[PDB]
């Protein structure tokens, strides 16, 4: 009775890179081959701009210089790869801004920060951008710096400065790479350089890497929510992200609102149907009208009867729907035996119940070790000694745990904002949660949809 169903370890998903080469290590492949989207010239050159107070601009130009020159990894050398220099590794020059492409924040921002007013501080930071907006064509990415003296307005109740800035500059189409003092004072340098460089390339152009072995006929959907603590009650702001590989070479990753008020994170019949309608209409527009054949709707909470009925009735019979729920905190945890020195291989899925499975999005990864090749690497070794798996509670499917598990595993590796090897959750869930935070901070965003490069 102690013998469970046999598991199968899904191998490490391959990532499409420069010249359609595949390598499961993102940074190693980027150094070796280059970005997938560099095959075409979406970014001609990464022209930057600075927005910071006059005192701390030297930090911005210093960090840009550090991006220009190669760096070596000091911490987590088990996984990271030596930086080859932005021009060498992304095959595109990184242009330092000239005098007019380099703005100065108003001194009134300091007064507002001393006053402890987050809303007015974000408004003033945005209003400082007019000098660059007269030259919006000149630059591609704006590096907004915030001095530590503004910490009092960085994060407090009912507010978040980063989300407010992102929601204020998203309709203005300019990507923004916010830099705090943390990126400056992080012990290691190759960490910050790799993260900032991949973010800069994604926000100026896009697609640093693309997941291979992706059927063009599947659209993956992830719903996630956030809470705004009202004085009387609460507001549950839920938003949905969508990923798919279209007929064109440009892999698409978008997010959107879901509309009024919600008291619970469970969508009703009409709201679920409307969101799903918007989703497959977006897919059809990106697929010249072709119907999706596989749909994956990942939700952090269980689908009610209304949500499943809305899913069933929104599509036609030809498009099978894979309604799956992702559980983050679970009691179970495993230990590999042959007992192994390193924890269980990443990607092992263990069918517990006919509808509930354990997926090991965390765990040892093979073939991505730089030093002592052949040794396994545990991404979260610093944080945890063992990997905590997630629970997939399939609410609607025809058959095959492998089909959804491999899709989730491949969706855990295409977060360009993530410096590390993978993510505990699929990019759909994480982007839906990020956009949920953004919408909760700024409710007047429900009108439009946005690409990933805006909010990553």
């Amino acid at each position: 009775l102690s013998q469970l169903a046999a598991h199968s370890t899904i191998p490490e998903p391959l990532l499409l890179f420069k010249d359609n080469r595949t390598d499961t290590h993102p940074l190693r492949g980027l150094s070796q081959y280059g970005p997938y989207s560099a095959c075409f010239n979406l970014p001609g050159q990464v022209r930057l701009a600075y927005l910071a107070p006059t005192e701390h601009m030297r930090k911005l130009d210093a960090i840009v210089r550090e991006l220009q020159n190669p760096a070596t990894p000091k911490e987590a050398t088990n996984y990271y790869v030596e930086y080859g220099g932005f021009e060498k590794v992304f095959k595109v020059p990184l242009v330092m801004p000239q005098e007019h492409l380099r703005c100065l924040a108003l001194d009134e921002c300091h007064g507002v920060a001393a006053n402890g007013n987050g809303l007015a501080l974000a408004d003033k930071i945005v209003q400082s951008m007019s000098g660059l907006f007269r030259q919006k064509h000149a630059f591609d990415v704006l590096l907004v710096y915030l001095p530590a003296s503004w910490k009092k307005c960085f994060e407090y109740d009912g507010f978040d400065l980063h989300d407010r800035i992102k929601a204020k500059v998203a309709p203005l189409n300019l990507p923004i790479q916010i830099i705090n003092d943390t990126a400056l004072t992080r012990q290691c340098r190759a960490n910050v350089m790799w993260g900032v460089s991949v973010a800069l390339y994604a926000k100026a152009g896009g697609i640093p890497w693309k997941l291979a072995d992706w059927d063009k006929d599947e659209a993956y959907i992830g719903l996630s929510y956030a809470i705004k603590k009202n004085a009387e009650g609460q507001e549950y702001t839920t938003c949905c992200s969508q990923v798919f590989d279209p007929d064109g070479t440009g892999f698409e990753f978008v997010a959107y609102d879901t509309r009024d008020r919600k008291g619970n994170p469970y969508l009703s019949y009409q709201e679920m149907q409307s969101v799903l309608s918007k989703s497959l209409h977006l897919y059809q527009s990106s697929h010249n009208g072709r119907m999706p054949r596989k749909i994956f709707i990942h939700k952090t909470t269980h689908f009610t009867e209304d949500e499943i009925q809305g899913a069933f009735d929104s599509f036609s019979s030809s498009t099978e729907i894979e309604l799956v729920q992702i559980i983050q905190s679970t009691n179970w945890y495993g230990l590999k035996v042959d007992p192994a020195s390193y924890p269980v291989d990443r990607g092992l899925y263990q069918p517990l119940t006919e509808s509930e499975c354990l997926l090991w999005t965390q765990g040892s990864v093979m073939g991505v070790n730089q030093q002592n090749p052949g040794q396994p690497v545990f991404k979260e070794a610093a944080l945890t000694p063992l990997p905590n798996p997630i629970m997939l509670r399939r609410f609607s499917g025809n058959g095959g745990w492998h089909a959804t598990c491999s899709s989730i595993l491949a969706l855990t590796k295409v977060d360009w904002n993530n410096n590390t090897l993978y993510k505990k959750l699929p990019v759909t869930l994480v982007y839906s949660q990020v956009f949920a935070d953004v919408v909760k901070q700024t409710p007047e965003i429900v009108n439009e949809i946005y690409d990933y490069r805006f909010f990553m």
């Binding site: 102690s2 019949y269 009409q270 009925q309 009691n331 945890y333 007992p339 069918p351 119940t353």
Partner: protein
Amino acid sequence: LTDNEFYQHYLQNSQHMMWFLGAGTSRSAGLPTASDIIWDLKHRYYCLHENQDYQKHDINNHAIKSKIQSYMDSKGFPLQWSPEEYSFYFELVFRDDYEAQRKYLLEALASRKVSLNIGHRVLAALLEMNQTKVVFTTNFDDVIETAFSDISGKHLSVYHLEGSYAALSALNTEAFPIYAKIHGDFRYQKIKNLTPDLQTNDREIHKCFLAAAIRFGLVVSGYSGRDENVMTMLRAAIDQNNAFPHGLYWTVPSISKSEPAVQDLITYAQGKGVRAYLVETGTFDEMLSKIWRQVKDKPAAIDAKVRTARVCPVSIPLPGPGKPALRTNALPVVTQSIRCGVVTLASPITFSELKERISQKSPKALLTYTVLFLGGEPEIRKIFSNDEINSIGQYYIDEIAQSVAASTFLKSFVEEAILTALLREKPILHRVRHRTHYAVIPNASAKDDRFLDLRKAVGFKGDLGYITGNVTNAKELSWAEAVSIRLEERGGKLWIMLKPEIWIKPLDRREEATDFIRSRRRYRFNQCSYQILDAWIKILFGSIGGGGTVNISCFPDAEFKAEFEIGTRTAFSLGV
């Protein structure tokens, strides 16, 4: 009239209810509306003369919609969503070619884009299970026909303008259910959709509606007036003896946005003696969902198709353990049936009241409410006097897993019982944090031989480790090894969850040792965690995890005793 009272009225008399659904239900069936048809026609018209690529620019874009509407207004056409526009654009595009008009209207509303939702399926179920007999519609596409064919499995008799008089006879001979389209199927020559055709009514269909008025009461949904012929037919139906035996219930998604024609017709009907009421019940789909919810004794065969989510999908079986194998922390509890004690109270009791009685009396027994008690009767007599106790009997839990899954009170009770059993005869202390239970090595008895293996588990490079002590930089915080033990219901099985933790003697001062808890747990890798879990299994069970079926009973010296049996080996499964 409030919506809930309307629902109660409809449920009270649902056997005599005509439905009237014109162009409002089709919005939610996946097929284009009137405005969508108008915009599609404008798109074709603009792309045709002004030579522009049809697929290059879409139709639901705001810019393209504005440009096409500006072009239409340039040639003097009607301005915006105004009467005599839909028919105008039809007669403009198709220049009086009713065959081509019919073919286009068939293609736009064809039976391939339609995906039945809950509303049409629920109405078709009402038709089949024979509550509503007549469903009049001003709508062309076969949404209700497809829903009835999908649910009932029987062919539905649709009536139209070709035959025309066919419906009246069916009414007279009670050939229910009848689904008479006042404007007929698009599969036939006459469609009656343009404004000039919308001023007249077919004589036989008019007579059929007038006759059906006396027999049933009407519920009209997804209809916003704007049609003169249907409005005058309804007005004529009102102007006759006992026009509606069950009242005309006009439902709109929003009372505020309802056209004044509907309101004045309702006032006229009320002035003519009928009890016609206008209610708002939200969308048609939600209305029909609620109506089906209030339906009693719905057949299972049709309800398996009405609500496909109600049946449980994805019952995908799991394979065998054939052919590296992860070793989880789950100990399977193979106990299937247990015995408990029940006390009957002369007055109703609350689970909170029993919890506070537990807190005050502190008996040597367990109790929960559902009052099921595990232990000795005299303890319950201490808790409850003879006056409040009526009788004390026995309870049998034939299926433990189903019982704990059904009621969370049973889950908590069985978890507490198994925890008490596991720590009944052992020196390991039993504490609780939040709603979880912790078995922690005691401070005084830390030098026991049964802990020595645990001492080996935490040891560095094979030397002797430490099990209990004081934090390196804390004033009074004391720390020990511990295991969080929980009950997990998985499918049809129960398992015991063990997780190694670092217990802190002060409950509220755990965070001050966080770094220490981190520092002690930095290097508890797979081998070390395997060793600690094996040591904890040995401590909690007394037998190594090979082929063991150790059985533990709680309160063995009590009349009501629970005897569980948990396999000493944690869950494992070799890879395929």
